[PDB]
Write a protein that binds this ligand. Structure first.
Ligand SMILES: Nc1nc2c(ncn2[C@@H]2O[C@H](COP(=O)(O)OP(=O)(O)O)[C@@H](O)[C@H]2O)c(=O)[nH]1
Length: 382
């Protein structure tokens, strides 16, 4: 996932600000913060505030960019394995001042704010609600970068995740989009992608994967030249990110030969399958049919551009997104062109879509059953 080439003649759309909450919540934000880029004067375009109980792992987290990040610790809350949300609630409150004071300065120019939290835990999970109130009462443009625990995480944990999802989904109107991350999915992906890899490389993989996923789209929307008036530039992007509800990012890279306008069903399926198999969490057609906003950017070389971006294509795409999200306000099928392209990736046609205003995924539903299975069986034994 190297962007050295693009970032050079490219540029970001929004200046994100990640508010870390808990071990995992800070692991991601920190990962997003420690991102060097070839952009114009700003190796580290992202800033973050790591808010978590004083632990040995948090006291371990390494930061590359000094000054763009600030660790905030909470005394007398070395919870640990306890994993009690309410506790994490008091902690954030008892230091509410010492925190916001750091948010009022570290984010004096952040177009958006990603409340990165690891659902299921106790610290982050608990403060996740008090953190939203803070950024809300102080009029900010924030979103929710949450992660869905896996089954092996045991009962208790799952109960915590579910507890907040419900609270969130019912107050989603009070803030931006919710970039849900399915740890179960990513975990199951890392096994396929790298079958030989060891379990000690997971987190790194995911964090570095979630960071690039979020960063890649932010870079694409404002690093290429449009082929027409239909745009999905920084301005439009900012919209999809401020719309309440879950957000699903999709990506698909194909070759010019593979892509056939005469026989679209061939690749359309892939795009339709790649759109269902989100980058961070799986989503079915049913859930997409209730999306408020959509967008699909196509990036390719200057030569394959004029040839590919014909009348038929543009429509075939307009129809694709159409059947996928019939109730979307507007379907900006904005095709872009990249001049500074490598002849190696010359015959490549990349896709980038962003579906917002989506309902809760099927995963959260499963996490409700896995908790039910346990509780029920725990009594079927009595
Ligand atoms: N993607 C990712 N998820 C994590 C990481 N650390 C923890 N998590 C997830 O977040 C959940 C809560 O763990 P953690 O954040 O350490 O608990 P907390 O510190 O009390 O908020 C776990 O069940 C994990 O699934 C991480 O580094 N990366």
């Amino acid at each position: 996932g190297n962007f050295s080439e693009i970032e050079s003649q490219g540029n970001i759309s929004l200046k994100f600000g990640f508010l870390g909450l808990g071990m995992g919540g800070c692991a991601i934000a920190a990962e997003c913060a420690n991102k060097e880029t070839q952009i114009k004067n700003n190796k580290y375009p992202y800033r973050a505030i790591l808010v978590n109980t004083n632990s040995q792992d948090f006291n371990k987290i390494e930061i590359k960019n000094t000054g763009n990040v600030r660790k905030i610790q909470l005394e007398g809350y070395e919870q640990g394995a306890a994993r009690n949300p309410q506790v994490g609630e008091e902690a954030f409150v008892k230091h509410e001042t010492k925190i916001f004071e750091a948010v009022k300065q570290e984010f004096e120019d952040r177009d958006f704010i990603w409340i990165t939290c690891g659902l299921g835990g106790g610290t982050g999970t608990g403060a996740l609600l008090k953190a939203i109130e803070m950024l809300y009462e102080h009029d900010y443009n924030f979103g929710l970068l949450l992660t869905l625990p896996r089954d092996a995480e045991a009962l208790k944990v799952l109960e915590n995740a579910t507890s907040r999802i419900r609270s969130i989904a019912m107050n989603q109107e009070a803030f931006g989009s919710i970039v849900l991350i399915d740890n179960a999915k990513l975990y199951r992906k890392f096994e396929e992608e790298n079958p030989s890899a060891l379990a000690n490389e997971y987190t790194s993989y995911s964090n570095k994967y979630i960071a690039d996923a979020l960063h890649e789209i932010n870079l694409v929307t404002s690093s290429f030249t449009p082929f027409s008036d239909t745009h999905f530039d920084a301005s439009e992007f900012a919209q999809v990110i401020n719309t309440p509800g879950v957000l699903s990012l999709a990506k698909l890279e194909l070759k010019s030969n593979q892509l056939d306008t005469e026989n679209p069903l061939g690749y359309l399926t892939q795009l339709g399958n790649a759109l269902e198999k989100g980058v961070l969490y799986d989503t079915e057609r049913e859930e997409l049919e209730s999306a408020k906003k959509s967008a699909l950017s196509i990036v390719t070389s200057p030569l394959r551009a004029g040839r590919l971006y014909n009348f038929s294509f543009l429509n075939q795409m307009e129809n694709f997104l159409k059947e996928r999200t019939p109730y979307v306000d507007e379907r900006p099928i904005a095709p872009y062109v990249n001049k500074h392209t490598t002849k190696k990736e010359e015959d490549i046609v990349k896709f980038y879509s962003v579906v917002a205003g989506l309902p809760l995924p099927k995963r959260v539903s499963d996490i409700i059953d896995e908790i039910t299975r346990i509780k029920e069986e725990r009594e079927q034994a009595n």
